[PDB]
């Protein structure tokens, strides 16, 4: 078992924060929830801004991880990464340190050719890298305690193009002159319903005869055996009527609405790394067959636009987007960034901090509150602000 | 062994048997049009032409009528048969009955402890999605008591309560020409567009490949002189390409082979959705193709109430015989230049627009095959075209 094995890496915060062990402990405060920002004395590539904050109490540690550095492919390749961990820190810490090496190795297989479109070769490298980061986690499970799982949002800049690769529910948007360019999509039971339902249909042994792949508008009761009810199948976007026939009384594979939706009443996110031994609650059904480490890759050509000082790429974990819409984030960046000197390298760290504070809020008597009395996010929050001007032509 | 229905042409053409026979001319290829004393719903235009030789009969079918649910529902349909004409004929006559029944199930609606609120449009989409399946299930049961060869793609449109519903299962296409704007109302289901679904299924159930097929895709045919050579591949979970050594199973014929619209599943079919094909197999093999096919359509909605449509705003439905030589832009160019030459209230204008489209795809025969503009090869497929004027879909 994994709890008999040593950790592969010690827990920490993003190393580019340059935190001492004492400074890490100050950050893990559930009452203060101190927003950590990147020191002015430690600059990230492209003067990238970073801010983070711990959850409001649900876990003792911040289970987000981040990694940022310039790789060199034997070509330089800028690398930003965000990982949202669950059921432990092991996956997110391992991924935050080893994924960029899988990316570097797969890119070396095609680096000559970069000097079949080339974009499809880069995408292919990222897709193999995610798969090989898994698998390595899978095989090293038997020598190290790589706990839990994590989602992964990464971006690389290779030869004038940004590649945004997502396997989870973090989000990347570009704010280019006030308009929002979405660079990622989320992977959830709602958004992946048909993939999961189809797999449950083609592989019914994965359901352990505790589950049905059909969806219903509500929990089917035994008193409705033989009546007519709306259902939805894997090859349907809409609903039609069916008679309930014993099988439909099994618990549904997908169940719930939005952020309460779940797969086998267990997971609320359907892609990422780790979770190799994760099981359904009170059951011996393995969840991993329904999860995928395959990212969705979206490309942005920085050559085709002349980016100004307030044109930024926002990477953030669901801790931000769960309380702030894309338009709120756009509004916030566009109002804050014109208030800092365009030549100040601390600019985008301050905007990142401003975003976190707008999502964390302030602790009142019945919880954390943001603007207009809304509830503030209780998750870990991590935010990159990447200024796109560092990607301009010449 | 007996035919479920007799072969024919669309009934709204009013053709005698001698006219049907006269139309099936591979050399002349006469463009049949909706006669001007025949009116379709919304004065819809229709025109068609037989292929340039690959089958004795026009394997396209089309069906256009007003369905009753208390509630009326305008219906347009196009079917592209292959490996026979029976599925297309059955579908042309029966799919609307299945659509009617599924809509009758939901027509009255149209007039912690979470409960999902289901929009009325989703009930309509569910009705169309179920109707497509039921039709294919009816073909599957009755194919042992009737000669219902072989298979067909299905594209249909219905207008129910001032919204258009376009359901596509095949490689026919629906676009809207509104002002000059092209509004795609459909997408194609081919080994190219559906590569990952097909690849994932072959991977999860490798017995469907028999033993003559690999589920991996390669940028060319992998040859014997390749073992251990290192070459690019694409798996079901990959949008891009990456390198791989090349082992011995990589030498089997690819599940997907070809490029663009010419790509094929198992060296047999070039479409992956439609009706029929239940006993369709790989040539000189007992590997069955139908596990990879799907009767499930995609459904797209256009809200007629949100735009005041002019006399030349039209919805174009055509089989691939048109789109395989004419782009969306050419069709848009042809429509926007032809229709201003006809009186807006002449009911025959949209039929003439459809004829102009069919003519621009078929071409003219000399000694160098069928030729359209700029000496291009014209389409030798069956071509069938609706031109549906959206002005007659305006509210109030
Ligand atoms: Mg987390
Ligand atoms: Mg989170
Ligand atoms: Mg045909
Ligand atoms: Mg055809």
Residue numbers in the entry:
A (entry chain A): 31 to 104, 142 to 182, 235 to 513
B (entry chain B): 35 to 103, 141 to 182, 229 to 513
From the paper:
The crystal structure of PPM1H reveals a structurally conserved phosphatase fold that strikingly has evolved a 110‐residue flap domain adjacent to the active site. Cellular assays, crosslinking and 3‐D modelling suggest that the flap domain encodes the docking motif for phosphorylated Rabs. Therefore, PPM1H has acquired a Rab‐specific interaction domain within a conserved phosphatase fold.
We also introduced a D288A mutation (PPM1HDA) that destabilizes a third metal ion (Mg2+/Mn2+) at the active site. However, all of the structures are identical with only minor differences arising from flexible loops and the presence or absence of the third metal ion at the active site.
